[PDB]
Amino acid sequence: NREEKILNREIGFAIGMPVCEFDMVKDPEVQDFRRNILNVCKEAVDLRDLNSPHSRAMYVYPPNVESSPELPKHIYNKLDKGQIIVVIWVIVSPNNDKQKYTLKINHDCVPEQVIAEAIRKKTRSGKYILKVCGCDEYFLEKYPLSQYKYIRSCIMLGRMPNLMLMAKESLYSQLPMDCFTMPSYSRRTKSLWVINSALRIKILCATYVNVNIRDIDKIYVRTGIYHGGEPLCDNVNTQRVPCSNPRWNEWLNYDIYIPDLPRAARLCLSICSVHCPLAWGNINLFDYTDTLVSGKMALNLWPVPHGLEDLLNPIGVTGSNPNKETPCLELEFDWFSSVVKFPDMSVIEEHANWSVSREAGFSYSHAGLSNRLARDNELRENDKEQLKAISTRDPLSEITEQEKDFLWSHRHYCVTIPEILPKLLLSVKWNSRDEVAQMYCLVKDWPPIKPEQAMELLDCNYPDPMVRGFAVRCLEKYLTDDKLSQYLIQLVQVLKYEQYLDNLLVRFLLKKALTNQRIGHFFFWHLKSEMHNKTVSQRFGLLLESYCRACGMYLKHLNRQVEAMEKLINLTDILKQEKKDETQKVQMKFLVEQMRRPDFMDALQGFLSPLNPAHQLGNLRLEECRIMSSAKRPLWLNWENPDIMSELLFQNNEIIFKNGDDLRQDMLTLQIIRIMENIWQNQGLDLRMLPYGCLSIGDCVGLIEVVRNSHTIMQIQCNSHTLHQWLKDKNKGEIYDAAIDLFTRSCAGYCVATFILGIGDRHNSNIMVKDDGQLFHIDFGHFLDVPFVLTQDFLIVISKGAQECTKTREFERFQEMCYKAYLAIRQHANLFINLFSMMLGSGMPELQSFDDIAYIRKTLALDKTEQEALEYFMKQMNDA
């Protein structure tokens, strides 16, 4: 058709990849994915069409609400007699005439109740909705007004809520309807258990294996069978062969029997020199149709990632390298006269139910022969008490083989403490179909666990699809849209661990992206920002294709953002190329020259901010745009806020564009800070952090939010009393007390957060202070390594200029904030551990092994008691 060719052009421009390149791939998994995923698209579109048009406005403008309607004490105490003061704005004439009506109402009022009170005091002389003044956020559901994050924050900050009445007809008429069309491209045996053979694989020859004859005599193929990074048997190598003729023609035998192969079994192989590795690759032993791979097949290998001292790379992704001009290794698997598939769930349930009756046969005498079969043995309360103690340890405490045998034995009891499932799963012998079949039935009826606990089951050491299917069940039952957005970074990353294109995790995330457009925005950009990475570009490219067909009109607004970013990349590439050594003035002349060409001049104005799509980026104030003093030439960009009420929120939107630095680390560290702030605010501990906008949009390219009215400590010094005098100066009179209080709280938060996270390299140019006293750190490149950090400059401010701070009462109140903030994060240690664990396959440099993560066990003292952990942080703080 004709409309389909335009839509494919729009999809291709958004992804940076022509749709026809997807059509060219003859891998049937690819084509099946492109068709089979389309039911998620129709379900999502139908969810947006049931109860139109309010259904599609919910989609485009979801409520921005907190997790729970309950308010902490320090929040409620902001509100005398449970009453909030809210200003409601109405425009009487089409000339944008302002009329404010101030209201005093209960915080739990639905937006309809706030419209009623506003319309009654409008007349003192069901057709409207509330909009946040200054940005495209709406209050469409019947949430308690205090539960919306904007209203909650206005209570938190002691700032005045500014809202606007707007008729429903206004918003609805500006939301175009979605005409999702199904595309022209959707319309297109013996079990393993009955095979008693040992596994053997044929390593025949290798091509494109050019390598320097210097320091190379012989080369050889190292293989290994793994299940999620743990070997199922011994690694078997091939025999050394000459470098000029890479032929082995060798069948390798492995200590594992075929019916015991787990579903997620993978062949991890590599080519190694003689005694270093050259290139690696992984193959799934089963395809996406549950078929034991049989026959000849060739694998294009991957270059060794810098830092890989091992010989195999079992955590790297699986599949052939798309660059077919790389080392290519040829393999052959046994055919067994028939198509071999993995047994049905009914066959597994039979074998497992059979296996439980074999237990009651064996009785108590036989139970002695195996420590893992302690089911028949009677269980003292010590056993129940040890299982409880095991279930309460962090996801990275070592589980001994005694404990693993102890866990398998009591699995019918572990169902009663479902939080122990992760450690239980780690106790299975995954190379025993007898045990695994029996674990499946446990997982089949396992009680749901918290989303924060289930996310662990999606990282790099739970590859089994039944384990991961249970994990998605949990998120799909308890994970709120708020928490989904909060954790979206990690949930996108764990898609890389998935063994196949079509899988329950991606169907979950895609459906939520296509029913919640705040989520779909960052879903898009987190995927788009890594299309340059060839290990996942095809995976994310196909997933982006299906998204762009069903997200609706927002595809047009996304392309609008993509070309904006693309012009900024091209323009900054030309600066780093042709004017990199010129003065900043010569660079600015060239910048203003390039920016005033007509094609560029609208590509970058009249689009939505990728940092926050509620923010509209109107006209560009070139007079306020500058190349920044930093290296890599950051662009200070300034747009007009075209909103009618821009003066009540922010009149200019200031964003830094940075080309050259990997921003994934800043984006992650600020996520952790935001979550830590959320934990502290829920426990009534008002420690004000500033998790500040930072989005990676591509390979060492991204956007950074500007916080206004802030200065670095180094500039403020331009005496240890110097900082405090600046704060006294900026904050005279009654403001002094609130300002000192704001600095002490923000300092406590960042002291604790930087200590826990091992945030080193902190100097007076990495710590800024706002005019209202808000301290906050910056440039989070390095992290997880450093001791507790408190300069004398900070302490003088806390004690309001006193000589000894330890002596004053304010330092006592400062410490209790830290100890409480420290113990609050420690009580949520599993959350942060799992979040970092999910980031291991990301390819991020500073999160590549569990050794990198072990440092938060040390700073949080998880192997000690909450007493002795507090004393450790008692000491770490007084060490100054």
Author numbering: 107 to 231, 248 to 310, 324 to 409, 419 to 862, 873 to 939, 952 to 1046
Sentences from the paper on this structure:
Class IA PI3Ks signal downstream of tyrosine kinases, G protein-coupled receptors and small GTPases to regulate cell metabolism, growth, proliferation and migration. They consist of a p110α, β or δ catalytic subunit and a p85 regulatory subunit (further referred to as PI3Kα, PI3Kβ and PI3Kδ), with a broad tissue distribution (p110α, p110β) or enriched in leukocytes (p110δ). PI3Kα phosphorylates PIP2 in the plasma membrane to PtdIns(3,4,5)P3 (or PIP3), which can be converted by 5-phosphatases to PtdIns(3,4)P2. Here we report on the discovery of UCL-TRO-1938 (further referred to as 1938), a small molecule activator of the PI3Kα isoform, a critical effector of growth factor signalling.
We next used a deletion variant of p110α (p110α AA105-1048)30 in which the p85 adaptor-binding domain (AA1-104) and a C-terminal membrane binding motif in the kinase domain (AA1049-1068) were deleted. This construct lacks catalytic activity but, in contrast to wild-type p110α, is stable in the absence of p8530. Co-crystallisation with 1938 did not yield crystals, however, soaking preformed crystals with 1938 revealed density for 1938.
